[PDB]
Amino acid sequence: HHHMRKPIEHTADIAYEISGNSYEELLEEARNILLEEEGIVLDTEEKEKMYPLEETEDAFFDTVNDWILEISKGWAPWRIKREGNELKVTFRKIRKKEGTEIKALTYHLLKFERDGDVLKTKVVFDT
Ligand SMILES: [Ca+2]
C-alpha cells in the first residue's frame, strides 16, 4: 500500500477585490488586472469592439472573458469609452507577455456590493 502526493486543480486560483464608483470603472480594474498579471507589453496597432453597458455580474463575466479570448488572439483591452448604453473597448496588439496566463474569470465570489459612492466585488480567476 502507498500514498502519492498529487496536484490539486482549482478554478479559484487568484483573487482581487476591485472597487470604483461605477460598473465601467470595475471593468477598467478587470482590465488593469489582466495586463498586470499577464505582464502584457503593448504594440501600437488598435482594434475595437462594443459591449453592452449592463451593470450585472453576468455582463461583467461575459465581457471580461471575451477580453481573455481576445488576449489569446493577440489583443489586449486598453481603453474603455462609454457610448450610450454600451461600452466601446479599444484593444492594442500585444507585443509580448511575461507572467501568469489567465484562463478565465469565474463566477466565484462575483457579486457587486454598493457602499456609499463605492461599487465593489471580489473577482476570482482560473489559471
Ligand atoms: Ca486552475
Structural domain boundaries in the chain: 11-127
104 CA → ligand 1 middle, Å: 9
Q: Torsion-angle region of residue 116: left (phi > 0), alpha (psi -120 to 50) or beta? A: left
CB neighbourhood size of 18 (10 A):
19
Annotated binding residues for Ca(2+), as ranges? 10, 13, 126-127
21 CA → ligand 1 middle, Å: 30
Burial of 63 (0-12, 13-18, 19+ CB in 10 A): buried
Closest CA to 81 of 46, 34, 49: 49
127 CA → ligand 1 middle, Å: 4
Cell of 127: 489559471
The DSSP result for 89-115, as a single string, is EEEEEEEE--SPPP-EE-STT---EEE
| Type of residue numbered 68 | I
10 CA → ligand 1 middle, Å: 5
Half-sphere exposure of 19 (CA within 13 A, CB side): 7
84 CA → ligand 1 middle, Å: 36
Q: Residues within 5 Å of ion ligand 1 by Cβ?
A: 13, 126
Partners of residue 114 on adjacent β-strands: 119
Is it true that domain 11-127 has CATH number 3.40.605.10? Answer: no
Cβ atoms of 70 and 77 closer than 8 Å: yes
Tell me which DSSP letter residue 123 carries.
Answer: E
Named by the residue before each, gaps in the chain exceeding 2.5 A from C to N are: none
Q: 68-73 contacts: CB < 8 A, separation 24 or more?
A: 68/34, 68/102, 68/103, 68/104, 68/105, 71/34, 71/38, 71/40, 71/102
